[PDB]
């Protein structure tokens, strides 16, 4: 039920569009709230979970926009664009990539997409 991890986190409020792609990068597994990104997008986002210097540099684009990367570690990637922002988190096998809207305050949307993340490892995914 991948498709329901993602319309929960939207049915939160706190996020309003995330996607599940395979660690690759390579597959969408479940989408909510229509969020895109371009290969290359993606391909510097997985990248970034091992090496953030890109990422520092350049920033996290996703859909065009730039997003200044903020926090970064093995397992997650913040960024942030004015009021609004982009959790990137990585499981055993997926990647989570979740915006929030300038309404909601960074703290509760990491918060929300990291108790997936939680739910996920604890599985194996």
Known sequence: ???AYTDNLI???KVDKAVI???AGDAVWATSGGLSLQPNEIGE???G???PAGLQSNGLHIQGQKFMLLRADDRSIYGRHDAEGVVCV???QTVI???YPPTVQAGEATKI???LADYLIGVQY
């Open 11 to 13: 049915g939160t409020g």
């Open 21 to 23: 792609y395979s660690r």
């Open 1 to 3: 039920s991948w498709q």
């Open 97 to 99: 990539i979740a915006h």
């Open 90 to 92: 990585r499981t055993k």
């Open 45 to 47: 986002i997985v990248q």
């Open 49 to 51: 979970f091992d090496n």
């Open 113 to 115: 997409v990291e108790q």
